[PDB]
Design a protein around this ligand. Structure first.
Ligand SMILES: Nc1ncnc2c1ncn2[C@@H]1O[C@H](COP(=O)(O)O)[C@@H](O)[C@H]1O
Lengths: 170, 170
């Protein structure tokens, strides 16, 4: 049983990842995986990830994350940060038929405000960055999701929504 | 005037949200109906609808259907309007350029297997049609939505979810 978590920047998707860590799931952050490769073979992080997808194909990060998983039994595996259907397709080829996409949604202005409130923050730059993420294919993953969780109110409503999706998946 | 843009994948029940608004008294313009009107004056004999839709975008740019839908509205109309079936962010931007900044995107979500299950009661064809809709840019509209309504249980819960969103918009 595998959960692929996707969401736009500032959606709070890692909060869903955190809730799954607490329930005993193996959680693998896809960017942590690319970063391990980066320290070895880097050059900004986005630049190195681009080179990987050109050399090895669009599903590369999924292959890398499966390597990181290794050969072990887990009740629940979670991959936090899926960006394309090419990745989803590699997770399915490698891990089988019990793979689910969960998107965490927040409208653009809410996400922008969360990011601007962090401890560039120009609105034009946050807009350009959504657009780069969309060009990688994240909108296609969201549109084809098994579950979409809205994070547009408080933490406690979000946590309840996360819990009920988890129950449906399990 | 308030502008409600409805987006969703084939078999998602986006038309049911449109229906509900229509039933409340809203002016609902169906984007594919506007395409069919153009079809009767510009299409090649026997041309597939999706093929014609792609050719209009080649000739007039990615925002055409929105422009056509605004011309359908008329300059003389200043009431709330609903456009059923937005396919891309280029359409959204055209609606904003022409009708201003009270523009709301509501996505109706259903997961792939559920939507396919509804339509069948040819699978590779359906998957193919989904791929064409994604290439038009529908996933980016969903990813950037103000509200995502999930239709994955029964009609009544879906209706209550639609009512809540429409209350927030009004
Ligand atoms: N913005 C648009 N909205 C809806 N339909 C469109 C648009 N542009 C082209 N079309 C054509 O209309 C078909 C049916 O639309 P719908 O009735 O919403 O499923 C689509 O698959 C397209 O081929």
């Amino acid at each position: 049983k595998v959960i692929l978590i996707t969401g736009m920047p500032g959606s709070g998707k890692s909060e869903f990842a955190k809730l799954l860590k607490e329930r005993g799931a193996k959680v693998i952050v896809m960017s942590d995986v690319v970063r391990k490769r980066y320290s070895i073979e880097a050059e900004r992080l986005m630049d190195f990830a681009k080179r990987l997808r050109e050399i090895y194909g669009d599903g590369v990060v999924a292959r890398l994350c499966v390597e990181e998983l290794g050969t072990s039994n887990h009740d629940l595996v979670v991959f936090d940060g899926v960006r394309s259907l090419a990745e989803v397709e590699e997770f399915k080829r490698l891990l089988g038929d019990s793979v689910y996409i969960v998107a965490v949604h927040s409208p653009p202005k809410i996400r922008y405000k969360r990011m601007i409130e962090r401890l560039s923050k120009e609105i034009s730059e946050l807009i350009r960055r959504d657009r780069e993420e969309l060009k990688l294919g994240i909108g296609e993953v969201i549109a084809m999701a098994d579950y979409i969780i809205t994070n547009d109110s408080n933490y406690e409503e979000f946590k309840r929504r996360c819990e009920e999706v988890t129950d449906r998946v399990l």
